[PDB]
Structure 1
């Protein structure tokens, strides 16, 4: 005789999950008991939103399934921002929630009576309420299959208190394996051929990676394909870390710096989009990054994304990882590829030029320029580090130093653009980075850090050595800029935050707190915090007036 909670955890074990992120409630205590018995850690936070964002972080930074665990009612409703974020970001999280007992349904009782499945339906791949304890294993496994397959996304499994506490005889119900191929589907040989023929006869070809390249992590395949063709590779934020293993001469970097190419007479001839959607990060349908004049080969698992905002030449529905593999295989059997050395140097030179351009207009005459601050962070970024970015102006500036470095992970806002998401995200990422030997750095704004500032307590309780760097410009920055730029100099309201010692908050939570206002003071602080196996907060006084290039766009 065992509980439905046991059933959940036994299935999670068989799926290979090793960590869950949650906040306790009576409704879901059978899952806690089971995890205690099985030595499965639940990283318990101070807010369900932080718990959900940790699950995302864990998934995004480890390329794993993330699992979030929340109680009925407010437990679920506090998880909604994570679910929506993961939905837009194509990130694989199983959200497990409690709900009211099915017996005594519709009795106006504690934490019951909200349609949690209806609320999640618009923003999950699947959302469903379990009706019987016996169904737990097959439904947990089905939810996980939905989460993990292309395009990845969140799933909500709602488990009534009733269903969880009820006891059945183990050995009346079978726990299935996760039987799902790890290699995705790949293009038809004729599409691959055509794609390769177009790639071969292009003068200025370019590859753009998006989130699905990251989720599948086919690093050795990518790098064989890139080495054979010499075609320079860009990424949106989520795909960036997939460039870390490529040879320098073909790291184009973040797609944004594709911006100035047209006016340099170097607008790409052809673009191979591998899970990079037409939208915010790729410049919508504007043709400012992905030129209207270019032939586009788009590979996405969702047919809707294929040429959504712009005409394309070849539309392939397939898995991105499977496709990368296929390109490598076809390309190992090839080796008649034109040089592209000149084109690669041009790509390199343009990225380099934007950087030096920015550098030529940055200061400290009584105050630290956000670009200078980002540079200080940049010199510590390599494959042994995951960078998590939050807070508008902060990350638009940070982005300019991200292309020339090679992070193990880079986790920035997706389409949701939700301020505050970073803290939970970074905490989940650090958990995943512990097995891989990486340090997680969170770079956030003074506004954004306030959303989840209580997580400092969690960092100390759980001994997670996350470094939280706050770019402190005394304001909701991008948003203050909008008011001045779009309305007028004296139209600034509700956008100032001229109060609060954030390092003191961290100190009062047990975390090491630093405050800095200079290139040299910040440098020393970050170095000292990296040297300690200890969580930290670095409160960086930074100038507000400078406008990052990406903002004017």
Structure 2
């Protein structure tokens, strides 16, 4: 067998059947004779390729396979890898290298010092020392991406390797099963459970790895047993809990003092599947108030090490959530009371308030819709106004890097063909990965893109106000016609200048058979 044949066999035996890519010359020997059981998803720029793959991996809860071109293609994807690192996304990033005989001379298209290029945003990064090693290196990449804590990995392959003979012993790779589905030992788990059972006023904080593990339902059982309020950890990349459940208390503010004040009076705070914590604004004060102690369950040693307070347990979130939910006592305390609905903001017949947009989406969207957020000044309102009952219903750029949601929404829609994806993206953010629209058109992936057009980088105006910074350039983005961009890439487009038009546009989009972009004129901040 060739390295080509052996590697595609390994991939299919490990459950991989899709290549997200933008091709180049070093990759043609890999892509040729493309197997009939695989499918290739082209995107026009590598941030788009990786964003699509990332949404697909996060929603499908399985690794996604990517093929990029050498250093320039890898480099174009590096901002997307920033986000994937902070979402623990299992991404297998492969890139083609020059033929081994010209790597030394640094021929055009040589990826120099290739393994160092995507560092520090990958868990593992490698270029094999010979062609026959390629399948074994691919096996390493698959497992490194997939083991807890999941994350992106990188493999560079000289183009001449694919046609070489494989090692006959590579067959031992095909059916390897690697598990990290582990939980705390019984003795120590009993100590934790007793601490939770004994707490007088526990609180629960959940992060993205809960949703990645599909631990959401177990966390609902845990919160119901403990009679405990539940928040989402700050800067949330995913939604780990039903947002209208009576225990839900919303998105935590991303500040040190704000969080310790919120937790004041809670004796035990159990954090599951989050860093402790993804603060943003500097809001100095106490990490925790006297009387509060914190216990974190995390799948990532790096998160456990860097928490500034609390105890930690490094284990699989699915296994731990299941065990805790099933072991804790039912407390005799009263179940928390559901938060009241948000108020309707006043809305005239002109430009839309973001609150109106989210209320209207909540009214019109299916109950199993999936939302993505890159409308960066409106996140708090989004979290208050969308009832997200089901797992896998929300994604936000985990590193804060714009350019995620537009492509990721396409990947999510590919992963979840029966759940309508609705990406709510600001006019600023829409540009970073605009060409991803083309992939939705070409493959008829029926994502709805809602562009919140207020003419400015609103979240930067917000932060400038926090800093009391004046005379800052570069904050306005006038003069973009998003319907023309959508037409450019073959996507049906609508505009909503007022509420009547927003309702009409959403009704048309929801009954369309392909992707649709709606440009919404929103109020300037």
Structure-to-structure mapping, 1:330-409, within 5 angstroms: 330-331=327-328, 336-342=329-335, 344-345=336-337, 348-349=338-339, 352=340, 355-356=342-343, 359=344, 362-364=346-348, 366-381=350-365, 384-402=368-386, 406=390, 408-409=392-393
The 2-side partners of 1:135 and 1:173 are apart by: 9
Task: Please state if 1:456 is matched with 2:437.
Answer: yes
Alignment size in residue pairs: 523
1:548 is matched with which residue?
Answer: none
Unaligned ranges ≥5, structure 1: 546-553
Unaligned ranges ≥5, structure 2: none
The 1-side partners of 2:173 and 2:263 are apart by: 57
Q: Aligned-pair distance for 1:219?
A: 4.6
TM-score (norm 1): 0.86
Task: Please state if 1:213 is matched with 2:210.
Answer: yes
1:533 is matched with which residue?
Answer: 513
Q: Report the secondary structure of 1:103's partner residue.
A: helix
2:200 is matched with which residue?
Answer: 203
Structure-to-structure mapping, 1:57-456, within 5 angstroms: 57-164=55-162, 166-168=163-165, 171=168, 173-174=170-171, 176-182=173-179, 184-236=181-233, 238=236, 240-244=238-242, 248-256=245-253, 267-280=265-278, 293-306=291-304, 308-312=306-310, 314-331=311-328, 336-342=329-335, 344-345=336-337, 348-349=338-339, 352=340, 355-356=342-343, 359=344, 362-364=346-348, 366-381=350-365, 384-402=368-386, 406=390, 408-414=392-398, 416-434=399-417, 437-456=418-437
Q: Aligned-pair distance for 1:117?
A: 0.8
Q: Report the secondary structure of 1:447's partner residue.
A: helix
Q: Report the secondary structure of 1:242's partner residue.
A: coil
Q: Aligned-pair distance for 1:400?
A: 2.9
Higher mean alpha-carbon deviation, 471-480 vs 235-244, is at 235-244
The 2-side partners of 1:514 and 1:407 are apart by: 29
Higher mean alpha-carbon deviation, 458-467 vs 113-122, is at 113-122
Whether the 8 Å CA contact 1:126–1:143 is kept in 2: the answer is yes
Whether the 8 Å CA contact 2:131–2:166 is kept in 1: the answer is no
Task: Please state if 1:498 is matched with 2:478.
Answer: yes
Whether the 8 Å CA contact 1:8–1:31 is kept in 2: the answer is no
More helix by share: 1
Higher mean alpha-carbon deviation, 438-447 vs 518-527, is at 518-527
Q: Aligned-pair distance for 1:366?
A: 3.9
Q: Report the secondary structure of 1:306's partner residue.
A: helix
TM-score (norm 2): 0.90
The 2-side partners of 1:494 and 1:371 are apart by: 26
1:474 is matched with which residue?
Answer: 455
Whether the 8 Å CA contact 2:132–2:167 is kept in 1: the answer is no
Whether the 8 Å CA contact 1:143–1:157 is kept in 2: the answer is yes
How large is the Cα RMSD of the aligned pairs?
Answer: 3.0
Structure 1 pair 519/145, CA: closer, same or farther in 2 (3 Å)? same
Whether the 8 Å CA contact 1:472–1:540 is kept in 2: the answer is yes
Whether the 8 Å CA contact 1:443–1:468 is kept in 2: the answer is yes
